[PDB]
Amino acid sequence: PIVLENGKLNINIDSKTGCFSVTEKTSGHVWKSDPWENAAGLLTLTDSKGKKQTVNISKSKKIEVSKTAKNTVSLKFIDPVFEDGSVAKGVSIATELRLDPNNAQLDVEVTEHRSGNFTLYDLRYPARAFSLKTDEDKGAAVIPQKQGVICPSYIFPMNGGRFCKWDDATYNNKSQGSLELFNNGTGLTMPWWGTYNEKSAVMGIVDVSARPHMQYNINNNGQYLFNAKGVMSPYQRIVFLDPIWKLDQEKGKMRISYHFIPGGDYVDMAKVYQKEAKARGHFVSLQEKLKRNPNVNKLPGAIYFGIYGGYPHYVNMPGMAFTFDELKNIIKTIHDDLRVDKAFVHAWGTFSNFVPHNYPISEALGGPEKLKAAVDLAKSYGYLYSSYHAYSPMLENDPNFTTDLMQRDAEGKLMNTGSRWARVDPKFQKGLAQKNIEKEISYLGLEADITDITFAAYRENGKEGRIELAKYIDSFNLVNGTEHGQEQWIPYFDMFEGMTYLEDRPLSVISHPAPLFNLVYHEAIANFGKIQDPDNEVTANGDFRIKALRSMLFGRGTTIFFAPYEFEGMRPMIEMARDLVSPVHKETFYSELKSHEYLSADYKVQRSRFSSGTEVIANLGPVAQKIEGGISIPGYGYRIQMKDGSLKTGHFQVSLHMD
Amino acid sequence: PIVLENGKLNINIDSKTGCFSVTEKTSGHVWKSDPWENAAGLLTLTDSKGKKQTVNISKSKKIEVSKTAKNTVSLKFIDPVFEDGSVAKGVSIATELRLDPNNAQLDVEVTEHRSGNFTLYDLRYPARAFSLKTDEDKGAAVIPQKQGVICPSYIFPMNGGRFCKWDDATYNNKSQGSLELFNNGTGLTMPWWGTYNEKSAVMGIVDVSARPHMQYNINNNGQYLFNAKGVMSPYQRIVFLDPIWKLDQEKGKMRISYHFIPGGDYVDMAKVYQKEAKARGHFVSLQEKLKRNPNVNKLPGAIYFGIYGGYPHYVNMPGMAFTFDELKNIIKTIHDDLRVDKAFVHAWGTFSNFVPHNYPISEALGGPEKLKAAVDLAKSYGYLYSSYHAYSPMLENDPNFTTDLMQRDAEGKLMNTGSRWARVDPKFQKGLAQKNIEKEISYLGLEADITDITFAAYRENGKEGRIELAKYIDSFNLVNGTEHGQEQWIPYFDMFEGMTYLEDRPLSVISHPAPLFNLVYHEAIANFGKIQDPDNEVTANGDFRIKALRSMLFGRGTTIFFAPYEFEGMRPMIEMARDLVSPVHKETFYSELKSHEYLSADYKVQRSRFSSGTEVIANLGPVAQKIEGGISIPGYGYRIQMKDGSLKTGHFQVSLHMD
Ligand SMILES: [Cl-]
Ligand SMILES: [Cl-]
C-alpha cells in the first residue's frame, strides 16, 4: 500500500484499486474500503450505444496512485471498462486524498473528470466507504434528514409491528436510495453525514460550493443489485452513506472533509459541524437577536397558534374563514380562560385578495379597525401576532392569475407549472412585499411577521432574489418567522415553523428521530411544529403525548394549528402544553442542547441536557422502563430536572369515560 | 348521434368521435364524455421510431359507429394519428356498448385490437368518463382501496393542516395515478369503482376474467399533462376513475359493466357488488361457517392478541423471544387480571427452525409440554390459540436456506429474489404444511390456525398451488385466519388479519376511509386490524381513540400486537377495548353492515347500522359536533344503540398526571 499518516490516523491506499482504509490509531478501529466489490468509486456513464451503465472505477485499464506531497496522494482512474468488456477510452477521473498534518481529518476531492465521447453522470466517491457491519458493529448511521435521524446498524427490541416493518425494509428497496441537500421534502438540512460504532465515529462535511446527493444503504446486503439478474446477493449486510457527485451538473469543488472522532456518536458529530456552521456565517445567536430586538423574549414559553381560515387557498371560504371578531374572541379565550401567558398568534385569512397580493385587510371579515382590535388585544397580553403572508404563489383560482411573474427556463418554457405555491420568480418578490407590508406594519402596529414558502429550501436558482427579500423583511426588525427554514436563512429570522419531520418519508421505518439540527442550531433559531403535522393532530409522527414529550427533548415549541370550528376541541391540549411543555421551552429557549442520549434498548427512553441546567428524560413508548440507578420512567412519562434543582415527574394517560 | 335507450337510461353516442353521454332518466343527471379533450379512449403505443406515445383514439383516420342490434352499438377506431400527424397504419380498436333492455345497466367492452407493425400498451376506455366537476358536483369517487375510501369532489371544512395537504394534493401529482387489483399493497380489493353526486351514482364492475388497472384523477385539472411542455393546463378540475386495459398482456374479456343508481352513493354501490360477489362464489357466510364449526362462536367479542417474539424473522432472539412459561403467564394475566372473556391468542415464536419448517416445538423455549400447558390454559378460558405459521418464505439467515424450492422464469432466473417472505413456489406449499401441521394439531389439541403471507393477494402466477394449500388447511375444520386476505379466499377462512389501511398510501391526504369491503363482506369474513398497525400503535391511521371508534363503525375486531416486554403498557388499552369495543363486536359479528353515513361536513362524525339491530355513531375528531335533532357527539366520542334497548354513550380523554 501507499501510506499517509499522522499522529492520529493511518491511511492505507491500495495501488492497484485506489481503495483506501483508515486506521484510527488510538482505538485500532479500521474503517474499511468497499466490502462488496473493492470499488474505489462507482461511475455512471453512457456506453458507445448511449445506454447508461454503472462501473467500478477500480477496474479501469489504468490506475495511477502516487504520493505527490507529504500529506497528499493523487489518484487517476483511466479508461474504465464496461460490463461487456468494451473500454470507455478517453474517460478519466482524478482525485486527491489530503491528510491534515495534525488532526484526524482527511479531505477527499474529485479534482478532474474527462468524458471523451461519452457522457458522465453520477460518481459515488468514495464508494461504500466508512461502513458498519450489521449485527457486529453496534452503532448507527447519522443523517440530518430534516431535524435528523439515526439508523442503527443492528436489530434491537421494539414493538412487534414496528419490528416487522423495520427488519423487512432492510431486505428490500426501502433501505437503499438517495437524498438531496437543502430541501423541505425528504432531504438533508446540513451538509454532513456519518457512521459510528462503539469505538469510533466518522463524518463527512461537504464543501460549501458543492451539491452532491447522499446514497444510503441501511443494513441491506445489496440484493437490489442482483434482482434483475435473478440471483441471490453474495454480499454481507452493511450500513453505508456515500456522496454522489453529479458530474453532469456540478461546477463546485467536489470535496468532502472527513473528521474522525474516537468514542464519538451523533452528538459529537453535530458539535464538529457546529464549528463549521459558525465559520460559514449561518450561526447568529438568539442572544444577539434579543439584543437587537427585546421583543424576541415574547417567544420563550409561547405556544404557536395558527388559526386557519382556509386562506391562502381560498378567500373567505364558508365554514373555514374566521371574522375578525371571532379572531379576537379566540385570542381572549386563550389568555383569560386557558391562562396562556405567552403566545404567537398567526391568523391565516386576513386579506381579500389572493397571495401574492397580501391586501387589503378584508372588509367582508370586518375591516381594518376590527382586525386592529384583535391585534391590540393580543399586544395587551404581550402576545406576538402576524397575518399569513406569501410573495411566491401564483394561483389558478386567483382572478388576477398571470404567467407574467413566472420564471422561464433556457428553452423559454414556464418553470414551476406544477408547484403553485412557488411560481413567482424570486427576483420579483421583494417588490411584491413592498406593495403593502409597510402599510400593514404601520396600521396594525406590528411587532412580528411570518412569511410562508420562500425560505423553506436553499436552491441555487433564484437565491439572489430570496436573499433580497430576506434582507428586506429583516430590515423591519420584527420578531419574525418563516416556513421550515434552512441553515442559510438563520441570520434573517427568529423562528422556523417546522424543521421537524415529514409524515411519510424515506427511512421512516428504519430510523429514529434525533435532534441533529437542534444539536447544532438551537441557540441560533427557535423552531416550532409544522402546521401540516401540528401537536393537535394524530399522525405518523405521533399524538399529543408523543409530540409534547419529543418537543421538550428536542427543544422545540408547541404548535396548535386548527380550523376555527375545532377550537373547543383544542382546549385540553392547550392546557397540557401550558402546564408541561411551556415552562420547559421557556427555561431552555436560548440554551445549547448540549447532549441527547437514547437510554433504552428500543430507543424510546431518551435524555436531553440543555446549557440552561435543564435535564429532560422522557419515555415515548407505552410501557414503563428503567434506566440507570434503577429509576423507572412511566410510559408516555417524563422526569425533568429544572435549573433551580426542582424535579417534575409525571405521565400522560388515555382514559375512557362511559356515561 | 346514435342513441341506446330504455326507460331508465339514454345513451347518446357521437358518431364522429365515439364519445358517449349517459342520461340517468329518474334524476335527470347526465354523465358527460371526456370534458378535457373529447377523447373516447386513450391509447398508448409505440410510433415509427419505437417511442411510446399516448393518443386520443377519437382522432383516428376512420371512426365507424353503428347500431348493430336493438341495444348494441359497435364502434371501430381505425388508424390512430400521432402527435406529429403521422399515422399508425394497420392499428385498430373495436368496442361495443350494450344497454340492458330493462335495467339501468351498460356493458362496455373492448372486443378487438390490431397492432400492425406497432406495439400496443395501455388503453383507457372509456376515457375520463363518469366525471364529477370539482366544486359543482357534491359527491365522491368511490375506490375499494383495501377496506376502502371515498374521495370527495369538492373542498370542505377540516383541520387546517389536513386542509393544506388535501387541497395542495389536488394540484400536484399526488392526485393522479393508477392502482392494481387484488394486492395487499396500495391496490383494490374488489373489482369495481364509481362516482356519485347528490342526484345519482354510477359504478363499474370489471369482468371476472380481466385485470385492468384503475386510473384516478382526484380534482386535478390535468396540469400533469402539461408540465413537460411548460404551459398551464387549459382544463377544468374534475374527478374521474378509468379502466386501464393492458393490451400487451390481457387475455381476458375486456369488459366493464356499468350500473346506474338514482339517489345512490357508495353504500348502494357496495350492495350492487354484493349480488355479484355471491354470484362469483366468494360469499360464504359466517353463519354457514358456524354451522360447520361451532368453535366460530369463540370469535365474537374476542380481542386478537399477537405476542411477537421476534419470529419468524429470528429464532430465539434475545430481548424479544418469549418462553412458553412467559406465554402462559401472559394468557393468564389477560384472563384473570384483565377479565378478557374471549380472545384469539397468536404466538409468534414457537418453533426452533425458520419458516417454512414450522417445527419442532422449541426446546430452548421450554419444549412441547410447556407449550401445551399454555395452550391448555387458553383452551380452559375458551380462547382460540394459534402459533405463527408460514409456508412461503425462504430466508437468507436460515441455515437451511436453499434456492431449490424457489420458482424460476423461462430464462432460468430466480423469481422473488426481492421478496423474502414469498419465495417458495406455491406448488410446494401444501407439502410443506403437511410435514408438521397435523402433528401440531394432534399434540396441542388445536382448535384454530392462522397462516401468514400466502393468501394476502390474488395473483395469477401460483394461484393453483395456493388453492391447494387453502383447501388443505380448510379440511381441518379449524377456526382459521390468514394475513390480509382477498375476496377469492373468503370460502376458506373465518377471519382476515388486516383488510384495513396501509399507513403510507396513494390518496391518503385526499380521501376518507369508508367501510366498502365490509359493506359487501362483513357477514362472510371477520376482520381484525393489521399486525403492522395495531390498535396499540400510534400511526398515520390513528391512535387507540381513533382506531377503537373506527373498529366499531366498520365492524372489525381489536388487534393488540406487542413484543413481550411491552405487555404491562398494553393493559389500559386492553381494558378500554374490553369495555367498549368487545361488546359491540360481539353483537354485530355475524350481521350485515347495512349502512354507513358521514354526518358532519368534515366527515369525522359517522353512523353505521348493523342488522343485529345495533347503531354506532362516533366522532373521530377532537371537537364535539352536532348531528340531526341537535344531538351532540363528543370529540373522540360515541353513541351506540344496542339491540337490548340500551344506549351507550361516552368519550376518550387524554390527561396529564403531574406528580
Ligand atoms: Cl420535533
Ligand atoms: Cl378499519
Numbering used by the authors:
A (entry chain B), B (entry chain A): 35 to 693
Per the authors:
The dimer is also stabilized by the swapping of the C-terminal strand β36. Numerous trials for obtaining the structure of ZGAL_3152 complexes were performed, but they were unsuccessful; however, buffer molecules found in the active site of each ZGAL_3152 monomer likely mimic monosaccharide units. Three are located in one monomer from the homodimer (Asp486, Glu517, and Glu531), while Asp202 originates from helix α2 of the second monomer. Asp202, Asp486, and Glu517 are strictly conserved.
Carrageenans, alongside agars, are the main cell wall polysaccharides of red macroalgae and play vital roles in the development and physiology of these photosynthetic eukaryotes. The marine Bacteroidetes Zobellia galactanivorans DsijT, originally isolated from a healthy red macroalga, is a bacterial model for the bioconversion of algal polysaccharides. Here we describe in Z. galactanivorans the discovery and the integrative characterization of the complete pathway for utilization of the kappa family carrageenans (containing 3,6-anhydro-d-galactose units, mainly kappa-, iota- and beta-carrageenans), which is carried out by a complex regulon including a dedicated atypical PUL, lacking the susCD-like pair, and carrageenan-induced loner genes including distal susCD-like pairs.
